[PDB]
Amino acid sequence: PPRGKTVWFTGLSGSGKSSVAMLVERKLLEKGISAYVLDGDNLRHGLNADLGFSMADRAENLRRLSHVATLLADCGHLVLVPAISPLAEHRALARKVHADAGIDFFEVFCDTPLQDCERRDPKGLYAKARAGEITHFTGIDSPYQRPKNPDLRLTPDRSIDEQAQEVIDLLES
Amino acid sequence: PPRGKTVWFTGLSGSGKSSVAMLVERKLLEKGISAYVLDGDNLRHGLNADLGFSMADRAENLRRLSHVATLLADCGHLVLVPAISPLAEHRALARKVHADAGIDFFEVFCDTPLQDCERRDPKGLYAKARAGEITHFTGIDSPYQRPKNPDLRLTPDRSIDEQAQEVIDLLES
Ligand SMILES: Nc1ncnc2c1ncn2[C@@H]1O[C@H](COP(=O)(O)OP(=O)(O)O)[C@@H](O)[C@H]1O
Ligand SMILES: Nc1ncnc2c1ncn2[C@@H]1O[C@H](COP(=O)(O)OP(=O)(O)O)[C@@H](O)[C@H]1O
């Protein structure tokens, strides 16, 4: 079967990465197109059980995710990676892993402002951060480096459904 | 798609793990079944680039391989893993990763005597070991713990084609 591709999200916690990724996966699976949401939180229980949450370990999580994505893509899947990916350097690294493998890679920026993400707070992570229960939380006490040249910028005026269709349009362009 | 399954080979260098794995992969793909050979040598260049060859790093290589295999199986592939896997603990841990995930796992022992493996010496690794250019070579220096209860035991009186079909018969059982 033909090589797949990778959509690499980036954005603040609660910006919509997983919501968009999951809906794109469903839309594609409804058409019989193999898609797969590769979420680091899932991998940390198994593949990445050796890692903690130091800065180096967060970078290594993303490095490994980039190689798992290239593997799944080479197996024919449309891979959707909803990681925060806060530093430019590790989005560049992840792209280079894909380019070295011959696999199409798209950087998709969920550009929702902090205030809006914090009002969403779907998992209560912002409430924990503000209470001092989580530190080095991207957007609060650790930096988010905004993508300068993303392939697609998703904005909060558009619905999850609309944004999902924009990702599919990108894939098909 | 229905969940896939993993075939985990084990055996000395030159016993036939890769040859059987690769032919099973071809036979299945020619029937339209989604098979994939997951080889740690390939992964060490990317995913597992951080690992060296200490005993602990060899174990961690296999631990990570077992998770990548479960992931690809959960994505619908028939996964073939041709690793030496010399310690019983390696193979038990790998099985338990699959069982915890709900994925069928088969331990296939390529039981070819050391002398016959050395007469094959397909990549010249035995010739290097005997000249003192390689060390910690399983079956010579470093122990190989023979499977006590494999799902299938492949013997060198059969052809690679015959052995491959025995693996498929196990899968279709
Ligand atoms: N485009 C959107 N329109 C409306 N609500 C959205 C939108 N994107 C996300 N949300 C809401 O915001 C929440 C946070 O989004 P989520 O996908 O969990 O973020 P992330 O995965 O980036 O942490 C979701 O629960 C969802 O209810
Ligand atoms: N059943 C067999 N009959 C004859 N030769 C075989 C058989 N199985 C393997 N071989 C030969 O031995 C070599 C085994 O190498 P390989 O499959 O790379 O072993 P491993 O992966 O176990 O190290 C192959 O080159 C192949 O030519």
Side-chain angles (χ1 to χ4, degrees):
Chain A
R3 273 167 181 177
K5 308 181 183 169
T6 297
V7 180
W8 193 272
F9 292 86
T10 180
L12 298 175
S13 184
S15 62
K17 303 176 299 291
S18 63
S19 298
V20 177
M22 295 290 289
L23 183 53
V24 171
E25 185 190 42
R26 291 192 292 272
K27 285 177 183 291
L28 291 175
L29 289 171
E30 283 170 2
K31 307 187 197 124
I33 292 174
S34 199
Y36 186 82
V37 176
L38 180 68
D39 192 319
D41 286 352
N42 295 326
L43 286 190
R44 278 179 171 279
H45 307 306
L47 177 60
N48 295 338
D50 60 313
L51 296 180
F53 291 90
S54 71
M55 284 306 107
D57 283 5
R58 290 183 194 192
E60 175 66 9
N61 181 64
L62 296 167
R63 190 192 71 81
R64 293 184 194 178
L65 272 170
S66 74
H67 286 288
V68 175
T70 66
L71 171 62
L72 291 168
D74 186 76
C75 285
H77 303 276
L78 188 287
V79 186
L80 299 145
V81 184
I84 290 171
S85 286
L87 306 177
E89 172 182 40
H90 316 284
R91 302 181 309 245
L93 288 164
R95 177 182 289 273
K96 174 173 169 59
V97 167
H98 282 73
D100 289 344
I103 299 298
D104 285 356
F105 178 96
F106 305 91
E107 182 194 53
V108 176
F109 179 26
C110 293
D111 190 8
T112 299
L114 178 66
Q115 280 198 10
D116 292 350
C117 292
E118 184 158 18
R119 181 61 188 90
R120 289 163 174 189
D121 197 24
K123 296 178 179 74
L125 295 175
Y126 283 89
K128 276 196 185 204
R130 294 306 186 180
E133 291 173 23
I134 295 168
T135 60
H136 296 274
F137 186 95
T138 297
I140 293 171
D141 68 318
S142 188
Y144 181 71
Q145 297 181 341
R146 288 169 60 81
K148 301 309 179 166
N149 296 289
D151 296 288
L152 178 62
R153 182 183 318 259
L154 299 177
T155 57
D157 59 294
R158 306 298 293 158
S159 70
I160 296 159
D161 187 75
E162 289 161 352
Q163 292 186 13
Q165 185 63 48
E166 291 186 65
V167 173
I168 289 172
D169 289 347
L170 178 63
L171 292 171
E172 292 179 343
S173 72
Chain B
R3 272 167 183 177
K5 311 179 183 166
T6 295
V7 182
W8 194 271
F9 292 86
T10 181
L12 298 177
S13 182
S15 62
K17 300 175 300 289
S18 174
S19 296
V20 175
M22 296 288 184
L23 184 53
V24 172
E25 183 190 47
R26 293 195 292 274
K27 286 176 180 293
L28 291 175
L29 285 173
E30 292 170 358
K31 300 205 276 240
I33 295 173
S34 292
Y36 186 79
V37 175
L38 180 69
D39 193 319
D41 286 352
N42 293 325
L43 286 190
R44 276 180 172 280
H45 308 305
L47 178 60
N48 294 336
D50 62 312
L51 295 179
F53 288 83
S54 72
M55 285 307 104
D57 280 8
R58 292 183 192 195
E60 174 64 13
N61 179 65
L62 296 167
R63 189 190 72 79
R64 295 184 194 174
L65 273 170
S66 73
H67 287 287
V68 173
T70 64
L71 189 154
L72 293 168
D74 185 78
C75 287
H77 305 282
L78 188 290
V79 186
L80 300 146
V81 185
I84 292 171
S85 286
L87 305 179
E89 184 186 11
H90 294 147
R91 309 181 308 250
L93 288 164
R95 180 181 289 275
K96 175 174 170 58
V97 166
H98 283 75
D100 287 343
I103 302 299
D104 286 356
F105 178 98
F106 305 90
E107 182 191 37
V108 176
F109 179 25
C110 292
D111 190 4
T112 297
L114 178 63
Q115 179 185 234
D116 298 306
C117 292
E118 182 159 22
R119 182 165 162 245
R120 286 161 175 187
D121 196 21
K123 284 193 160 77
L125 300 171
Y126 288 89
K128 284 177 72 81
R130 303 325 191 167
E133 293 178 12
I134 297 168
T135 61
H136 308 102
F137 192 104
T138 295
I140 293 171
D141 309 298
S142 188
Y144 181 78
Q145 297 183 336
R146 294 168 56 81
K148 299 182 181 168
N149 299 291
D151 296 286
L152 179 60
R153 177 171 163 271
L154 298 176
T155 56
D157 61 320
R158 303 289 177 223
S159 68
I160 294 160
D161 190 72
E162 287 159 359
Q163 294 174 337
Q165 187 58 45
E166 290 188 38
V167 172
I168 291 170
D169 292 339
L170 177 65
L171 292 172
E172 292 182 346
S173 69

